């Protein structure tokens, strides 16, 4: 784990043009970027704080575009859906983005 941040993990509901809570359950998650040193790969993993449901487990491929829409809501795409992180604070956002931006540099 190269970072941990507190955020409401969201996915975009294409049909209804709205963000919904990842995994179907509202509430905050603790969100990590994990580094597999043996393979030099990264993934985003997040667990609901209250009940530890895993709500996101997403690879970070080389070239991913990570969009800092606001100081506290960052987002990125994959073929299946758009992911969003609504951070609890500007500090959580910057810690996570810094790690993401570093991960993307070293891939």
């Amino acid at each position: 784990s190269i970072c941990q941040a507190r955020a409401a993990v969201m996915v975009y509901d294409d049909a209804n043009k709205k963000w919904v809570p990842a995994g179907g359950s509202t509430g905050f998650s603790r969100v990590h970027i994990y580094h597999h040193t043996g393979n030099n790969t990264f993934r985003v993993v997040g667990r609901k704080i209250q009940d530890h449901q895993v709500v996101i487990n997403c690879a970070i491929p080389k070239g991913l575009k990570y969009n800092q829409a606001t100081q506290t809501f960052h987002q990125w795409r994959d073929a299946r859906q758009v992911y969003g992180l609504n951070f609890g604070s500007k500090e959580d956002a910057n810690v996570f983005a810094s790690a993401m931006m570093h991960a993307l540099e070293v891939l």
Binding site: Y12, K17, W19, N67, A69, T70, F73, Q75, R77, V82
Partner: peptide, 4 residues
């Protein structure tokens, strides 16, 4: 990107 969709807005927040």
């Amino acid at each position: 990107x969709p807005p927040x």
